[PDB]
Symmetry: D3
Subunit: 243 residues, 6 copies
């Protein structure tokens, strides 16, 4: 291998500059199967890699795992191997009443409730998505005709307290995050996920292109396989426009 | 007046929902003159307002003055009068070697080196431009055929120390901003201006649409003093792009 | 012009070392008219400058506009032209029940709710006024016989959320500023304005003398809407004090 | 099928276990369970691989967290929901002190919080401190098998590269905040870099849960960058033995 | 003297490496009396130093005073003279209902509600006690048979607002510390004291060994005013442990 | 026996005194009290020694705070509970400006908050500013006895060594945050380093209490026991003269 964790050489990529980067290792095969000639390359820790062909061009699918820390490893090591465009497809919990289960969300920029983003840029730096990647994702969503919302995402280092979940062992949330969901809601924040702040910050501050799309599987103010499928079809179609 | 500072009533706007918001009061007449039926409304402090017509739709032009504080007054009071879409046209100093004087820059999001943005959202919230507004600006720039760069802008509460200028009375820069320009440069930040962080943060966190475009009148890696001939042309170029962008957002 | 924004040369100042700095461009002529041989020098953006004579000595009057950013430009460029003493005269909203409309307030130091001050000194540095300038202002207020209060001012980068105003488009205040007015009240903070933190910090950390005085045109515990007639009368009273204080500092 | 959102485990699966060994690597779970009696695989979902084993008749859980605090916080919280009250982390690490060699084992008393997830449980001023009984058991377990052990502070980073001041990267640069940071930690007596302890220790100590932290040194930063693969396998096996032995003392 | 404040030479220590460090200058005479051959070395400001002998090995007793600042002076200057191990014995207010008056608490690590710790390490660095020192203290407590609790301590720069006391002149607590006691309680924090954060941070970040033990004289969930004889009983109760722990560390 | 927790004082002990001179050094308390009429010891507990004196007919309290904000906050709070509204601090200091000599007196208008205790009373953005009347009285008192006086900003640190960028220490190092900090303060016109003013000034200004700060320069960092005694007496004579104007 040419990298520490991913178990990949530059030869394995076949000159690929684009990667679709899901959180779940189990999703990698499902995404690649929507493209031509998909093949498993490697699987180490939470990092599962497949290579596939899209319109004649090689494309990488690689899992980051949950959270910024492993995302930062995966994105970086993919960049070392020649990847320049990163497209994240994820799952999410919506926090706006008008967003339904099954809807797809494209993130323009993220609220940085993570730690890893700070290792690339100070907090004042915007966790903003690449304009071309966001454009391609919005266009791809319209192409397949999905209910789409474009806007800001809250990207949290935890699933529970950082997303103000009280149904926990302790049953409590630290002062900093007490009443935080309501605050994000009033600010027009669409949803909660766990990787976008790191991905978008580290790419935008390093000359790498990044896009973010997610399927709504739950609304916090208020099917799962169908939603994931819908979002997977959009992230592949967006990659088509960006090759 | 329905508002504290602008000297405008809701009737003055005539159903306007879009405003073009330059920093310079003197730019307001120049922007309005590019549109149909341009008329002066009010001038109070650094807030000069004109109304014009675009494709039969009333549009507002209102100066913010330099900086987030007066910007925040202008945007708040315009929102109270019915404005939902805000398009900023400004001047800027580029910090990337590949960006030339005369180029136009569209801001996707801003580095928050301001104070006023914090009065609307905590620092972790992105000073991000509205996607439709950014799209319209990029397309408008492509329509008139200008050299355009799209990316991140550093928005500073000062012209001098916050933009790491040493040619000053004290000749020094506070620790926090020492070596900061080099840091932004390495992070791919295009330019320095003084209003976008406040504008973009306050709009994105309040359900208002905002866009940001600027003409490059200086490149900080090449030359210090701006040219008093290209500055006129650059301002004209950017004004034509913002007006065309407004046309797409009506 | 020797400076980027003010449109002034060293000659225009005629050796002046003191500047009176209001926020309102229209207040500039009103201040200069109180002194001898008043003359207009320049008007660019929110910066309007007049020169006058006080006790046979040249004095500058120059508007800053609303907010620290434009204040920081004006002060820096005045310092480059030879100004070493800055006296701010402003308007303010009082937050203590014992301070009435028409009262004058002298600021010893400011709560830094701004961004621009951080570009000159870290937050831990006090936004403190110059002792000689404060003394002259207190004595000048006692000379004309005005109701004066001396103490701490909250200096905000916004007019609305940073001063906990809820009568807005959004109708909400960010967590950081929720309940903040009551907190300042309990801490003995007199009032809200928008420039003192920047002015005082940037001067005290650069060897420049600064003073701050303001006329109360609204009390936030009593009412919200200012009166038209008393506002002009209060401005007149404070302008008299600032000129009288400038007399003592020449 | 599952009493929790991510782990794919019911409380019935645990059989009354109150102690969990939490490695970062999913593939290490099978290795840890093989040291104990009657090992069975319970679930495999995402980065969370769970095995059940028996130690002195008492059931023990081994469950991977994955790299970093975010997934660690999910694993720990969901195991706590299923009845786990004691957590023991076994990991790999890069040492930053010249006197610590490759193959050495490190027990963490407390961690420098260079992570984000810990803040979601307690403000920065709260110490990322390990449980005293867990730390005691780990030190005693290390002395029991006779390993070269160092006890002290660990720097726990949300990144592998810039947060651990690695310059051999795509960008080749480190953000101002972390520039010269390794030297600063070195002077402060910080032993090593890893990626989970700050989250684990903070979230446990602020929620009445017992946590311990042990790691095998596979690289010294003042000596080299690329780890030796032979000594890595030996160090991993060495550290695994200590964490199982420490689990014995805490049951 | 070789130091600025303590008034001691390297000679006066006689090769001592361990120091017991109480806050109360009056406690120094009490701790030194428990060991063989006690003598007064110096009394300057809040620093009183006594030399004693334990198992034929010289041990130093030196008062820090209340708070981090003077603790930072005492520890640093003792370290210059040759002290490598520090054992703090203090008084404390418990905030957990299960901890009674008379109980002894051993601190593994401290919540950093102080300023001095930041002068040695950034906030993210843990205010953790030395493992050997903590072990010796726990074993010493079990040796004499006291009711002991081991865990986290909140170390505050104030006695009143930082420990959320409302029975004060102002009768108020700053926003940051409002509801803070309840938060620490839920996080399993045992108690409040005023020196451990500084001591533990400065030692752990400088290669020095530090331990922390305290006697509970008040319970915040029970009664606010300290008791009669049991208060004096608790001091002598806790003093014996810190000397027995010193025996294990020599 | 006691109305407070630490000082060991009752409201009756004060005799209606509203002003208190607060040195850091417990041994300085007797020195200050001896300059006024009828000096008498009240209490000596921990680091807090209290003496009562009389000035111009009106009673005055002198009480030591000890070094640093934490114990200072105890002293000031408990004195305020007993009826003190005006606090005048007299201290020693290390000057960091080349033009300030050993023996000079410094009056603090406001302080750089390099302490922790001030934050327990007001957030960092709040100015550690001295009371205008107290500062006026101190400046006038210094001019009255004819001392070389400088008025301006003071850096108030929670440590004597690293926070004042001293490298002659056990570790020989200074944490990143304070590395190059002295030079930064110097360029900002900060006069000196001491250890109590930020806490005192913040806690008083945010609680409706009047506070003043004066210090004698015993060392200049850009560049003695006998000079230390003469400087102490110079500043003490000023702080008592300032107390006369404020009663
Ligand atoms: O609220 C969320 N927050 C969030 O950060 N994500 C993103 O993925 C993080 C790891 O699941 C996703 C969601 C939506 C959600 C809500 C409840 C349980 C979830 O988890 C897995 C699961 C799927 C189907 C049935 C039960 C549990 C996910
Ligand atoms: O570097 C900059 N930073 C910046 O924040 N802006 C935005 O406008 C702020 C008010 O000028 C604009 C610039 C470009 C620039 C560079 C040097 C002097 C400048 O000042 C005024 C001016 C305009 C045209 C010709 C001479 C002077 C402006
Ligand atoms: O509360 C205040 N806060 C404050 O920062 N200032 C300083 O001037 C800022 C620019 O107006 C002034 C005030 C007092 C005040 C209160 C309500 C409306 C205000 O606005 C302009 C106005 C003046 C007179 C009559 C109608 C509107 C001013
Ligand atoms: O410096 C470190 N920092 C750190 O946070 N860890 C903890 O595990 C993170 C995942 O490897 C581990 C190390 C040690 C290290 C150094 C270089 C490459 C590494 O990665 C994978 C690998 C293991 C063995 C042989 C070659 C590569 C690990
Ligand atoms: O809650 C506390 N917080 C704390 O930081 N300490 C540590 O000592 C600080 C100086 O007393 C000690 C305590 C316990 C306490 C509670 C009320 C009054 C206290 O003070 C001195 C006193 C001793 C005997 C009789 C009355 C008061 C001490
Ligand atoms: O630099 C200083 N910083 C400072 O915070 N202070 C205020 O007193 C705090 C405790 O002494 C005082 C000074 C001046 C100084 C310089 C060197 C040694 C010092 O220490 C005590 C001493 C007294 C008499 C003879 C020699 C040293 C004091
Ligand atoms: K302005
Ligand atoms: K992970
Ligand atoms: K003290």
């Amino acid at each position: 291998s040419d990298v520490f964790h991913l178990g990949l050489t530059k030869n394995d990529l076949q000159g690929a500059t684009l990667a679709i980067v899901p959180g779940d290792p189990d999703r990698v095969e499902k995404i690649a199967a929507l493209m031509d000639k998909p093949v498993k390359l490697a699987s180490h820790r939470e990092f599962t890699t497949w290579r596939a062909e899209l319109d004649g061009k090689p494309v990488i699918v690689c899992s980051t795992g949950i959270g910024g820390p492993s995302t930062s490893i995966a994105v970086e090591e993919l960049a070392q191997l020649g990847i320049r465009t990163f497209l994240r497809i994820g799952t999410t919990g919506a926090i706006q009443p008008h967003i339904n289960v099954g809807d797809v969300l494209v993130t323009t920029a993220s609220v940085r409730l993570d730690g890893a983003s700070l290792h690339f840029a100070p907090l004042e730096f915007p966790a903003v998505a690449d304009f071309e990647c966001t454009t391609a994702l919005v266009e791809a969503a319209k192409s397949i005709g999905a209910t789409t919302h474009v806007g800001v995402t809250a990207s949290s280092d935890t699933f529970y307290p950082g997303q103000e979940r009280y149904d926990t062992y302790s049953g409590r949330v630290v002062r900093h995050f007490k009443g935080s969901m309501e605050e994000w809601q009033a600010m027009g924040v669409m949803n909660y996920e766990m990787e976008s702040a790191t991905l978008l910050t580290m790419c935008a501050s390093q000359g790498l292109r990044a896009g973010m799309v997610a399927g709504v599987i739950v609304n916090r103010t208020q099917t799962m396989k169908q939603t994931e499928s819908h979002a997977v079809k959009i992230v592949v179609e967006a990659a088509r426009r960006l090759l």
